[PDB]
Each structure stands twice: as C-alpha cells, then as structure tokens.
Design a protein around this ligand. Structure first.
Ligand code: G81
Ligand code: G81
Lengths: 181, 181
C-alpha cells in the first residue's frame, strides 16, 4: 500500500493537473507529448482551464470499442508547447487487476488527496447512468462526486481513470496502452 | 512517505470515526478507554453523532496551557461501552518535527482520504481566527475546510490534530502524551 502511494504521489506531481470545463472541475493526467485524458462526461469544449490558465483543445476523441460501446474516456490534444513526460510505459495492454490500489485526486475540492481503495477487479460491463459502458475496473471504497478523472494506481502501474460510483463501490475506465498512437 | 501512509491507514481503521456536532462534521480520534479528541472549534454538546449514532458526552475538557492560552483541542469522554485501542504510546511528550507526514481525514465530505503534507515544523505561537494559540505544528500543503480534526501522522507517530489553514499552509495542535491522565 505504501509503495503504491509513493508511486502515485510522484506520478501526480509529474503528470497531473487540475482542469475546468463547463461541466466541472476534474483531475487530468497528461500521457505523452500534448495528449491527455479526461472522463468522457467532462465534455471538454474548444478551450479548457488548466491550472487556472486558458488552454485551447486542438482535438478530442471520445473513445468507443469496435461495437460503438462507450469507454468513458476522452483523449484531448492541447494547444500547448510544454510536453508531458511520456508515461505510456505505465499503461497496460489489457485491464489490470491488482491487490492494492490508490486513487489520486487533484482539484480545488480535493487538492492532492489519495484514497486506499484496496482490491481492483476487472468488472467489465456496466450500465453507467443509462450508458452501456465497457472495460470498467471496480474497487470498494465510498465514492464521491468531483473525484471523476482521479487516477487509479498501484506500484509501477497506471490502471485507469475514475468515472463513476455510488456509496461504497467505484469504477474506473481502464487506461490501455493502445489508446495512445 | 509510504511507511507513513501505511501506518496512517491502519491507525484510522483502528482508532478514527466520523463525528457530527452542531458546528460541523469532524474526524475524531479515539485515544484510550472512552476518551477521544476533537478540535476545540467542534464545540461538542451533551450529545454527538458518532458514525451516525447518537452518543452522550459525559465530559469535555477544553485544553489551555498554564497561562490560559488556547491549545485548540477538546478532550471528550464518551458514554460508551466499547473502549478505544490505547494509542497513548504513539503520542510524543513534546511537539514532534518530522520530514515526511501524512494528514488523514475521515468524514462524509472526505471519506478515508490522505494527504502528503511533507515537512512538519514546530510552529508554536499563532493567532488563530483572533484566538492566540500555542503548540502549533505547520506543514505546507493547500488546506481545506472540513479537514478539521484530521490526524497528522508519520511512521509510528501521531503528531497532532488539524485545526486550521489558509491556502497553502496548514496547522495542527500537537497531541501530547501528558494530556492523557
Ligand atoms: C464523477 C463525475 C462528476 O460529475 O463530478 C463533478 C466533477 C462522478 C463519480 C462520483 C459520483 C458519486 N460517486 C462517485 O464516485 N461520476 C458520475 O457521477 C458519473 C457521471 C456519468 C453519468 C453517466 C454516464 C457516465 C458518467 N455517473 C455515475 O456515477 O452514475 C451512477 C451513479 C448512476 C453509477
Ligand atoms: C477546519 C474547521 C472547520 O470549520 O470545518 C468544518 C468542519 C478549518 C480549517 C480549514 C479552513 C481552510 N483551511 C483549512 O485548513 N479550520 C478553521 O477554519 C479554523 C476555525 C477556527 C477559528 C478560530 C479559532 C480556532 C479555529 N480557523 C482557521 O483556519 O482560521 C484562519 C483561516 C484565520 C487561520
């Protein structure tokens, strides 16, 4: 649990930022170059607020599987000269299960906070607020609004981005290496 | 940092609870027997809500130093049959300075969340919302309301209870062994 939090702290310091769109404030992970990721429901517009600064969104790609099913991630390319430290190395080719995970959040409401969610099991299909969604990871821990975009981690692994929950169970979209080109 | 979070997680699972008084929701640490502690400004009444259950407060002791100066802690004795795991062992005789601390919070707003605040230095005197207060510990990390009562920790140490902050600096009241009889 300790090595997981250690990795997470370092990851967030190097690769995360706080973002505001018109739909809310989110944790954002930069992945490589000028590509980052948000939960789909962040619905980023042509500009976002990134650490309180206006940044133009050159592209966004709402992710779906081969059968059009929601994956609940949006990839976004930022009109930005600074490049993100390449963390593609830490993204698995398929859905990761781990015994001890940490969820890391970094917004105004939750500034640099970490939750030990423990066991993450590949959950797969879930009806998410009416929306059939695939590739979900599930953890038991009492979830809260404004945690969407939180980064799910274990030692040496970035497992996915937090997208949903109710009460005592949360879900992340798996963050798969092949989503990045 | 990892061993600190590890210790904290275990400490909170064993000794913390979520409490509501008329002045808010707080993190509460049970110390020994039926004695626990809250930040002074929690102003506990004759009953409190402890994990959603009504509990009678048999005693409360607002702590001050020999010269009457506020210490910003209230000790409270709960009308309760279950006894807290004795953690007096983990409380220093004087104000602890450490290189890596974690602040642990456990309420509805922040359920089982942990913050790496890093370096804790004995700050001592501070004018806290008009109130001259002593024995303060200071850490740099961007503080937030509803974190009061959070438990400040490092490996094998319970350093104090979070009582204040603004922006980017937070303060705990040192949790000293001799406060417990
Ligand atoms: C995070 C997103 C958000 O709107 O916060 C403001 C920045 C939130 C997860 C929270 C809410 C309570 N527990 C949590 O962990 N996500 C949602 O509320 C998502 C939003 C969504 C709706 C429909 C499709 C995709 C995403 N929905 C969600 O948890 O829905 C349930 C409760 C029906 C499962
Ligand atoms: C926690 C207590 C609270 O009222 O939350 C609701 C449960 C809060 C600390 C927060 C606020 C913003 N940053 C933080 O870390 N504590 C306070 O706001 C205390 C309350 C207090 C006032 C006067 C004497 C003693 C305690 N005050 C505080 O931070 O005051 C400043 C901002 C003037 C330093």
């Amino acid at each position: 649990m300790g090595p997981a939090f250690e990795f997470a702290v370092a990851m967030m310091k190097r690769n995360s930022s706080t973002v505001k769109t018109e739909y809310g404030e989110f944790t954002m992970l930069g992945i490589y170059d000028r590509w980052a990721v948000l939960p789909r429901h962040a619905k980023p517009g042509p500009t976002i607020l990134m650490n309180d600064q206006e940044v133009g969104v050159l592209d966004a790609k709402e992710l779906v599987d081969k059968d059009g099913t929601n994956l609940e991630l949006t990839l976004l390319k930022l009109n930005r000269n600074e490049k993100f430290r390449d963390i593609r190395g830490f993204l698995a080719k398929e859905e990761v299960e781990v015994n001890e995970a940490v969820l890391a959040i970094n917004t105004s409401k939750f500034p640099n906070m970490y939750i030990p969610v423990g066991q993450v099991t590949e959950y797969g299909f879930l009806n998410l607020g009416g929306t059939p969604t695939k590739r979900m990871l599930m953890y038991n821990f009492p979830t809260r609004a404004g945690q969407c975009g939180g980064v799910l981690m274990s030692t040496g692994k970035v497992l996915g981005i937090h997208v949903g929950g109710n009460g005592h169970q949360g879900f992340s979209a798996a963050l798969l290496k092949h989503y990045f080109n």
